[PDB]
Amino acid sequence: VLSEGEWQLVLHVWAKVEADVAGHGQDILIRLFKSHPETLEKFDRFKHLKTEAEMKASEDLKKHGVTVLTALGAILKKKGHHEAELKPLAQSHATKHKIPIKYLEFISEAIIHVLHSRHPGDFGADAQGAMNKALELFRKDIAAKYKELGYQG
Numbered sequence: 001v002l003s004e005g006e007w008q009l010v011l012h013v014w015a016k017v018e019a020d021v022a023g024h025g026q027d028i029l030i031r032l033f034k035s036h037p038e039t040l041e042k043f044d045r046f047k048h049l050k051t052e053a054e055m056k057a058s059e060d061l062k063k064h065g066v067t068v069l070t071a072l073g074a075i076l077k078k079k080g081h082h083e084a085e086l087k088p089l090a091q092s093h094a095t096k097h098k099i100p101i102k103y104l105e106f107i108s109e110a111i112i113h114v115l116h117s118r119h120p121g122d123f124g125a126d127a128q129g130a131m132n133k134a135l136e137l138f139r140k141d142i143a144a145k146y147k148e149l150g151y152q153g
């Protein structure tokens with residue numbers, strides 16, 4: 001459970017991410033794809049992208065980044081009371097998209113890295129610690145739904 005002070009650090013930086021969701025989304029997905037190439041294979045629509053330049057020029061990739069960040073932002077703003085938003089997501093990622101929990105850990109790492117590159121001032125160690133706890137809570141809650149459905153892993 002994050003404390004009120006920790007949720008405030010998380011949402012204060014998130015408010016900045018919202019100033020340019022598309023730019024942030026693009027940066028995150030590219031970092032994920034370059035650091036863990038196996039993640040790209042889960043996207044039939046992005047499989048054809050071979051270079052970072054191709055990735056940066058893809059409008060469709062940018063649109064998916066807005067989708068991901070908008071859904072995450074909706075969750076974070078719920079401050080832990082996020083059952084209604086989380087279940088649908090866990091269900092589709094477990095049974096339709098077939099995304100192992102480990103990939104959620106990889107995208108969390110990509111988010112933390114990009115938040116650091118873009119907002120050093122609002123993203124020091126304390127905010128970094130609170131964001132990591134928020135992302136862990138997100139994975140933990142998704143992992144429990146995955147286990148119920150038989151996808152733990």
Ligand code: COH
Pocket residue numbers: 039040042043044045067068069071072088089092093097099103104107
């Ligand atoms: C490694 C792949 C990967 C990761 C880690 C990931 C991580 C996350 C994540 C964590 C921060 C969030 C908040 C979301 C949120 C979403 N993802 Co994904 N998804 C992933 C692969 C996918 C795929 C694949 C789809 C469908 C894309 C398509 O083909 O249109 C998807 C679709 C979605 C959608 C549209 C509705 C739905 O299909 O469920 C939302 C919202 N998501 N995703």
